[PDB]
Amino acid sequence: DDQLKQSALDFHEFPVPGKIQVSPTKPLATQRDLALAYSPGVAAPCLEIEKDPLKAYKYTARGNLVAVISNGTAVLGLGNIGALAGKPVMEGKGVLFKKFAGIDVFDIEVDELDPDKFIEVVAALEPTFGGINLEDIKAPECFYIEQKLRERMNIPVFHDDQHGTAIISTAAILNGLRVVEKNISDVRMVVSGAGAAAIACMNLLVALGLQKHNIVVCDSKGVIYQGREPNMAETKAAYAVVDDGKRTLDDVIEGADIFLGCSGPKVLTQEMVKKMARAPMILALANPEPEILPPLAKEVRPDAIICTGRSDYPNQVNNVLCFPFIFRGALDVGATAINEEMKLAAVRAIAELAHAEQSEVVASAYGDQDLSFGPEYIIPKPFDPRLIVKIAPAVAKAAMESGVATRPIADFDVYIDKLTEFVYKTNLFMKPIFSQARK
Amino acid sequence: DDQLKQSALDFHEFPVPGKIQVSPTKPLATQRDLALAYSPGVAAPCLEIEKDPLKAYKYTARGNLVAVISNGTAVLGLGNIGALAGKPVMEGKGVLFKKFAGIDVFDIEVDELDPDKFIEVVAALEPTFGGINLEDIKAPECFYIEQKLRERMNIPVFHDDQHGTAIISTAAILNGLRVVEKNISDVRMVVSGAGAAAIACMNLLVALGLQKHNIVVCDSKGVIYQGREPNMAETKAAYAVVDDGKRTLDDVIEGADIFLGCSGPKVLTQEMVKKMARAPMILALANPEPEILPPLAKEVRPDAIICTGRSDYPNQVNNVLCFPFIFRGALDVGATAINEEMKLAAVRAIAELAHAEQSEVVASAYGDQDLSFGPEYIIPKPFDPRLIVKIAPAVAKAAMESGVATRPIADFDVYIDKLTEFVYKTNLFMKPIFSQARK
Ligand SMILES: NC(=O)c1ccc[n+]([C@@H]2O[C@H](COP(=O)([O-])OP(=O)(O)OC[C@H]3O[C@@H](n4cnc5c(N)ncnc54)[C@H](OP(=O)(O)O)[C@@H]3O)[C@@H](O)[C@H]2O)c1
Ligand SMILES: NC(=O)c1ccc[n+]([C@@H]2O[C@H](COP(=O)([O-])OP(=O)(O)OC[C@H]3O[C@@H](n4cnc5c(N)ncnc54)[C@H](OP(=O)(O)O)[C@@H]3O)[C@@H](O)[C@H]2O)c1
Ligand SMILES: [Mg+2]
Ligand SMILES: [Mg+2]
């Protein structure tokens, strides 16, 4: 801990303070160059945007600018630490946005703790940005804030901690259902924990075909049943079950095909997994420590499919899998929203990439490929270079079909060539070398 | 126009859209590199800032980050064009901030037209930035907005269109009084126009020693006198004079030592210059076309000292002379404000650089130096490389003495050497070559 802490503190304070810098995209050394980057020259772009608001994507950086906005109320796993203390996290997220999709990011830390005040603050910034990524806002205010901002603004508003993990988890459940040969309309699902990542996953899975009468939820109190507390929260009363004497996790797990966990460590035990239905699908996403260790489940039930959020186990749910590429697809077509069809276009592409993989140009002997679709490889690996070329055109085409695109793509072959060109300029070959050298 | 228009539109539409890009400052290609910039690594800086908010300058880019914020209500000379149409101007101002002082800038365009709502939007963004530059906001809302933000926020708030021109124009008058040998407390000033740049100039000049009873202001209606309109706006009533019959500019120009002009073209005539006192000091800053052409003034009064806002004449009052360097000085010492003592320190440094000049290392014959103090050289030239080495330490020292500095500078020789190092690594040698080539 101390070594990791010291290496992180020095990781960037010493060369210059902090990551991120703003750089001009032009050489500038003369007059007549400053006379049209400013001065009477800069009045020509302004008078064009005034006549046509759609011309702002030609003359400014708006078509490539995303805001990462937070108020510091749920920062990683630290909790409520304040907007100022969460600045490094937002800078890091902007770094990830740039590294894997080439998207410029402004990270904004708002001091408002009141939801309506926060909404008023964010809705006023629309002319600056081409899209908004809400990050690290505690539940249940996140649902209300995102819903209000989405119905108030004419640029995409995407809360990543809700919807990115939902997209990845839905892609994993569809692929796992193929392995175990079940149907989405018959499966019994048990959800542990209600919160930012859980409500959104249930919503997406219902949108793809899961029956709401096949879902039971449990939180820190136990089973969410109807009339348990006098005033149950919204989004918690939409999944409450009729009272039947069931109050703990052990009552509802018998016969469950799917376990979805986003709540605490050591929640699911070996006996409960034993009582589960044949070929169980288990998603233990609790971050410091999963609800069950994958070795402890594969022993009692070796036919189980397990999917955690850690890097030392297969099938890792890492949010870097979708957000840069969905935002790239939305930005490149001038979409005014990221709707459900665009969101479902991302689920299908991610699942397809893992069960229709066509490798090519492996990392020599330097690594470990085993990209065979099955219980151990159900979703793509977090830094797979083909994720930009699969997701972004699918999201762009979905945007063009739901009528939310303002700058439609004429030829998708040219677009795919450009994206492949971008991805060739970025390879991470030291990662396979380090991984192989670990053994 | 059409040639200039087409060249300016193409200036940045074609390589990529718009100026500005966001770049990481640390190399990112491996794991353990995207595990300190994010992942469990990024939690260590966050817990440091939670304990001590001052550590946000060590682990984060806040100590070098400035916001240029506008609502597009007074954009250059175009007027009320909207926040979105003014985005190129803000990007250009950020580029100038980066070129001459090495300061990262986020340009923010806010759609709010209501002053109190605008204030609520801006004050909430304080954790993001180390300082605020207000830009292109029409009067009289600008005074109210700036006063409220300054009393509300704990980082420097600085409206450039008021205070930068006030500082530069006060430096010119201070030097011109040296040339013409007059005392600040005994001169009569006539101000043509009352607005963002005029009220601020008068306030600063009065702060330096001008008697308020030696000032007469004259807006588009003529002389501003007591009881002229039923509800005379504030900032226009503190400079109203008693009613004496004086209504036009012709009745107040006789015997005036200083004429300050920030209102329209062809306001001052030759016969009105003929009536001024000995050695008239004239500042005609109306940007499209000045109040009087300097040749027309010099024809009748060869001893007159004329300043303009146009570069084709000597003594050009250009805002690039002030804002980057005062912001650099305030940022380097952790100033929580830019008060009056810091504003006047910048006035003296600018005046000293021109009346106590020691040239050295001219651009050989490639240029036109003639940097001798006198009527034709009263303030430094717009891109003089010694401006940051003179202004930033003066402002930092003033912040240290007025008590608003949170990170005092221990050694000023080290600071000056660092600023000199920055100056060396950015030289504009093509400008004097082109200027001499034109002659
Ligand atoms: N892709 C990923 O790896 C990924 C993505 C998102 C989240 N996660 C992880 O998932 C966890 C929760 O994230 P979140 O956004 O959902 O935050 P959250 O809603 O604030 O926390 C989970 C919620 O579930 C309930 N809960 C907590 N402990 C529980 C327990 N032992 N048994 C049952 N319910 C419990 C609590 O709700 P009540 O207090 O109302 O009962 C709690 O607020 C964290 O560990 C997070 O890191 C992982
Ligand atoms: N460093 C520089 O070169 C520099 C810096 C700042 C400004 N400027 C220039 O100065 C001018 C004014 O700037 P500002 O910010 O003060 O704008 P402003 O506040 O919008 O306009 C100046 C005010 O002067 C009055 N006025 C207008 N025409 C007049 C006339 N013909 N005779 C007398 N008064 C008149 C009007 O006040 P009423 O409507 O209340 O009568 C007007 O609102 C512009 O040309 C601007 O570009 C130059
Ligand atoms: Mg997050
Ligand atoms: Mg301006």
Author numbering:
A (entry chain A), B (entry chain B): 2 to 440
Paper passage:
The PTA domain does not possess an enzymatic activity of PTA but acts as an allosteric modulator of catalysis; that is, binding of some metabolites to the PTA domain increases or decreases the enzymatic activity. Binding of acetyl-CoA to the PTA domain is known to reduce the catalytic activity of several hybrid-type MEs.
To find the acetyl-CoA binding site of EcMaeB, we collected cryo-EM data of EcMaeBholo in the presence of acetyl-CoA (EcMaeBacetyl-CoA) and determined its structure at 2.03 Å resolution. The cryo-EM map of the ME domain was ambiguous as is in the cryo-EM data of EcMaeBholo despite the higher resolution. As with EcMaeBholo, local refinement of the ME domain dimer sharpened the NADP+ and Mg ion maps. Due to the ambiguity of the cryo-EM map of the ME domain, detailed discussion on the ME domain structure at an each-residue level is difficult. However, cryo-EM maps for secondary structures show that the ME domain of EcMaeB moves when acetyl-CoA binds to the PTA domain. The movement of the ME domain resulted in a slightly narrower space above the substrate binding site in EcMaeBacetyl-CoA. This observation suggests the possibility that acetyl-CoA binding makes it difficult for the substrate and/or cofactors to bind to EcMaeB.
